[PDB]
Design a protein around this ligand. Structure first.
Ligand SMILES: [Zn+2]
Ligand SMILES: [Zn+2]
Ligand SMILES: [Zn+2]
Ligand SMILES: [Zn+2]
Length: 157
């Protein structure tokens, strides 16, 4: 007999179907609670949390570690790339020299004194010393564990 779909309760007569969260699904019936994406096509897994079944992007958005920019004070979503210095995170466009206002980018030399960033050519001698190298941007949310991840298997009926 046909398997029943956990999404709609109907028999699955489709040639291709999904298995996830130890249920069978018509692919169209396995959708992100937030954005309605068809999980079996967009990616390889779903995330279960707080009664929802989510795509990776909405799992990150709703449950990932957001932060805040040390320069402007405003929130930074878990999905956003940030610059780092001295244990702080920054919007890319907030990561600027305090003297000349140039945006600092990976590989640039810079100084940091009490929260103020300075480019290589604006060494604040009067205030002063250590030269730092700007790292590549990284995701605000960083790495996260797979405890809520549930792989999707694409099957032929
Ligand atoms: Zn269905
Ligand atoms: Zn989604
Ligand atoms: Zn900012
Ligand atoms: Zn400068």
């Amino acid at each position: 007999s046909w398997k029943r779909c956990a999404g709609c309760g109907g028999k699955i007569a489709d040639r291709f179907l999904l298995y996830a969260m130890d249920s069978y699904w018509h692919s169209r019936c396995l959708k992100c609670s937030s954005c309605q994406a068809q999980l079996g096509d967009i990616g390889t897994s779903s995330y279960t949390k707080s009664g929802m079944i989510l795509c990776r992007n909405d799992y990150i958005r709703l449950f990932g570690n957001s932060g805040a920019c040390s320069a402007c004070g405003q929130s930074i979503p878990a999905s956003e790339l940030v610059m780092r210095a001295q244990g702080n995170v920054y919007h890319l466009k907030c990561f600027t020299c305090s003297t000349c206002r140039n945006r600092l980018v990976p590989g640039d030399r810079f100084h940091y004194i009490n929260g103020s960033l300075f480019c290589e050519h604006d060494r604040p001698t009067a205030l002063i010393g250590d030269v730092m190298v700007v790292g590549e941007p990284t995701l605000m949310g960083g790495e996260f564990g797979d405890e809520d991840e549930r792989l999707i298997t694409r099957l032929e009926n």
